[PDB]
């Protein structure tokens, strides 16, 4: 099976020379709270993103870009990241001894985290003195309100 | 070492190919050397055996030279003239001892139009090879 699939993609690559095997796909954020800070490859680019750079759906499809008109952006940073990706790709494309790009086009890379610095004094004014008490009040806010209502109802009905 | 993958290296399949071969393949399988003199003249190393060829035999218990009287293609052997089983009577007929064509060198060839032409065909092909190499 490994050999069969390699032969098939070799034939297709010859047929469509010098196009790449893959379309340009967007960079998107993984769905969970658990996979929250890293990116991956999506299905297509939004029409808002295409309106960023000029291209229409047909024109982008022709020059080799996956376009997904069912996706909607959730913020402005999504747009900025993907418009940078579109803009750079349109920079790096040529249109007609040519070179046929291999693999995924512009792979997504997730950088390792670096350490930063700062000042204790400016850090302190962001937090109260008893952070654990602060957090505990926020955590128990609703339950205490229900209990407070129940007590006030006790006294009210018992006059 | 073989490289070609449509050709078996399986003993069962090779032996079944040697038997049950068709007549043209069997005829090609029944070849023998040309002598040095005919090698010089025709520039060819081997020929399929035939009636009317004169053959010089070695490596066997029936050694001699004679003309090919019969071809037993089912057996892959040839009945030569003068080379017989030792008979019992003084009168009774001869009975040929069958010789296998690879135990012979052909000494003098039967010629006709087809023999001439196929030899010249083979020379021109060997020349193509010699020009390539």
């Amino acid at each position: 099976r490994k050999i069969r699939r390699r032969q098939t993609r070799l034939q297709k690559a010859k047929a469509i020379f010098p196009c790449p095997l893959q379309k340009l796909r967007p960079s998107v954020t993984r769905c969970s709270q658990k996979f929250n800070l890293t990116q991956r490859i999506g299905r297509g680019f939004t029409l808002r993103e295409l309106q960023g750079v000029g291209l229409s759906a047909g024109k982008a499809r022709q020059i080799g870009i996956a376009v997904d008109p069912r996706r909607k952006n959730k913020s402005e940073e999504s747009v900025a990241r993907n418009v940078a990706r579109l803009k750079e790709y349109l920079s790096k494309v040529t249109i007609f001894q040519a070179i046929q790009h291999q693999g995924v086009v512009m792979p997504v890379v997730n950088p390792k985290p670096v350490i930063t610095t700062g000042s204790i004094a400016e850090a302190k004014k962001e937090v109260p003195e008893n952070l654990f008490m602060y957090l505990r009040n926020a955590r128990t806010a609703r339950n205490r309100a229900r209990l407070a209502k129940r007590d006030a109802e006790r006294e009210a009905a018992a006059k | 070492m073989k490289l070609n993958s449509a050709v078996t290296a399986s003993r069962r399949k090779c032996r079944k190919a040697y038997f049950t071969a068709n007549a043209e393949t069997r005829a090609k399988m029944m070849s023998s050397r040309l002598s040095k003199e005919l090698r010089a003249e025709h520039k060819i190393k081997t020929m399929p055996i035939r009636r009317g060829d004169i053959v010089e035999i070695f490596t066997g218990g029936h050694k001699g030279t004679g003309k090919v009287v019969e071809v037993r293609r089912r057996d892959y052997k040839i009945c030569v003239e003068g080379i017989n089983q030792k008979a019992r009577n003084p009168e009774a007929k001869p009975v040929p001892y069958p010789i296998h064509p690879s135990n012979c060198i052909i000494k003098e060839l039967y010629m006709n139009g087809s023999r001439y032409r196929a030899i010249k065909r083979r020379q021109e092909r060997n020349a193509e090879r010699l020009a390539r190499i």
Partner: protein
């Protein structure tokens, strides 16, 4: 390998280690786990407390990544800093240049307080803290921060 096994050292012995009085029969106790309340009760009570019955609330579909919650101790915070800059941060302990560690970038949410920290100020940014984690950090001169 078949040639190093117990079963072949029993050739010429009739029964093969299974006994003459008892023997080897199909299923002399039943199949599977059956009998746990009747004739296997001694086994089930000796080795499996709380195998029978019911306990607690049930959820018809659990959200695995909602309920996911990784955690880090404060004795691990200084190993997320690469090895080639801790010596310097330790030598020049600064209120004006302090190491900032963000633990959600490394994939932890809450910070607990097992262990101890070196005598050096540090900001730690997480999404929730435990009481003695806060205590020990604010005791060494660090600051707890909440990160989005």
């Amino acid at each position: 390998p078949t040639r190093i096994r117990k079963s072949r050292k029993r050739r010429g012995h009739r029964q093969m280690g299974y006994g003459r009085v008892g023997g080897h029969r199909k299923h002399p106790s039943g199949r599977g786990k059956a009998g746990g309340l009747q004739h296997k009760r001694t086994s089930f009570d000796k080795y499996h407390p709380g195998y029978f019955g019911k306990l607690g609330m049930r959820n018809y579909h659990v959200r695995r990544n909602i309920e996911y919650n990784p955690t880090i101790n404060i004795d691990k915070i200084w190993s997320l800093i690469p090895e080639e800059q801790r010596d310097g941060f330790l030598q020049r302990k600064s209120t004006t240049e302090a190491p900032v560690v963000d633990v959600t970038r490394f994939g932890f949410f809450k910070v607990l307080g097992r262990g101890s920290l070196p005598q050096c100020p540090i900001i730690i940014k997480a999404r929730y803290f435990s009481s003695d984690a806060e205590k020990k950090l604010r005791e060494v001169g660090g600051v707890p921060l909440l990160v989005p």
